From a paper:
Structural information on the parent protein of mRuby, eqFP611 (86% sequence identity with mRuby), has been published, however, no protein structure of mRuby was available at the time of initial RCaMP engineering, hampering optimization efforts. It has previously been shown that pH can have a large effect on chromophore conformation in red FPs; therefore we determined the crystal structure of mRuby at two different pHs: 4.5 and 8.5. The structure of mRuby at pH 8.5 shows a trans-isomer of the red 2-(iminomethyl)-4-(4-hydroxybenzylidene)-imidazol-5-one chromophore, while the structure at pH 4.5 shows a mixture of ~60% trans and ~40% cis. The large difference in pH had no notable effect on overall mRuby protein structure (RMSD = 0.13 Å for 208 Cα atoms). Similar pH-dependent cis-trans conformational changes also occur in the related FP eqFP578 (70% sequence identity with mRuby). Crystal structures of mRuby at low and high pH revealed a cis-trans chromophore isomerization in acidic environments. In contrast with the chromophore in the structure of mRuby crystallized at pH 8.5, the RCaMP structure (crystallized at pH 7.5) shows the (4-hydroxybenzylidene)-imidazol-5-one moiety of the chromophore to be a cis-isomer. Superimposition of both mRuby structures and the cp-mRuby domain of RCaMP demonstrates a slight (~1 Å) shift of the RCaMP chromophore (red structure in Figure 3C) relative to both isomers of the mRuby chromophore (cyan in Figure 3C).
GECIs are prominent tools to monitor [Ca2+] in defined cells and intra-cellular compartments. To create a red GECI, we selected the red fluorescent protein (FP) mRuby (an engineered variant of eqFP611 exhibiting high thermodynamic stability and monomericity) and replaced cpEGFP with circularly permuted mRuby in the GCaMP3 scaffold. To aid our protein engineering efforts, we sought to solve the crystal structures of mRuby, RCaMP, and R-GECO1. High-resolution crystal structures of mRuby in several states, as well as a structure of a Ca2+-loaded RCaMP variant, aided optimization of the red GECI scaffold to useful performance levels.
Numbering used by the authors: 3 to 62, 66 to 221
């Protein structure tokens, strides 16, 4: 397969949140067939970010989902060309973030480009005040949709003082394949656990890992 048991990734993610422009770069590796990955991320422009890095964390990798025998893997089948994803995330207190992402494969490395735009986060809220504490584990429902997939998520962002902020989104996953076939899965789910491993004081440097497993 073009997707090996060990694969490296690199990412450029840029955009703005509440008018604050930034750019990040990341690089990492994982085992796509075990659904595990780690990435090391630096804020290279606009730092220190005046908002929680957690709102960006889920924008930095669908090739690394452990899919059983019996659920077709849309993502791995999309190579060499790869896939795109487009997401809007809506937070219960009115933040909205739109993300556009491209996934390519270049010289044996997965290459990601993401653009993000967040607006209307309350200035006083946990995101803009940097009072968040990571994401609860969650399950994304995956639906077949006219040759692509729609993912649907309700996630809980932990906040200081024993709170959460709920958010939801729909993701549209599209293949870039111009030659060849894709076997489409049926409805399924993907269980995620996204963990912050390292961070610097002002989140200029973050290391995170994910474990993602598909199920019926």
């Amino acid at each position: 397969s073009l997707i090996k048991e060990n694969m490296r990734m690199k990412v450029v993610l840029e955009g703005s949140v509440n008018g604050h422009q930034f750019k990040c770069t990341g690089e990492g590796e994982g085992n796509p067939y075990m659904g595990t990955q780690t990435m090391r991320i630096k804020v290279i422009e606009g730092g220190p970010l005046p908002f929680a890095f957690d709102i960006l964390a889920t924008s930095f990798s669908r090739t690394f989902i452990k899919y059983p025998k019996g659920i077709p893997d849309f993502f791995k089948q999309s190579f060499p060309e790869g896939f795109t994803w487009e997401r809007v995330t809506r937070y219960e207190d009115g933040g909205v973030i739109t993300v556009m992402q491209d996934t390519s494969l270049e010289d044996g490395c997965l290459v990601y480009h993401a653009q993000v735009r967040g607006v209307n986060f309350p200035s006083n809220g946990a995101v803009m005040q940097k009072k968040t504490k990571g994401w609860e584990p969650n399950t994304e429902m995956m639906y077949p949709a006219d040759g692509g997939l729609r993912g649907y998520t309700h996630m809980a962002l932990k906040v200081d003082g024993g709170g959460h902020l709920s958010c939801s989104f729909v993701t549209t996953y599209r293949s870039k394949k111009t030659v060849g076939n894709i076997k489409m899965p049926g409805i399924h789910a993907v269980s995620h656990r996204l963990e912050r491993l390292e961070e610097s004081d002002n989140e200029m440097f973050v290391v995170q890992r994910e474990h993602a497993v598909a199920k019926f």
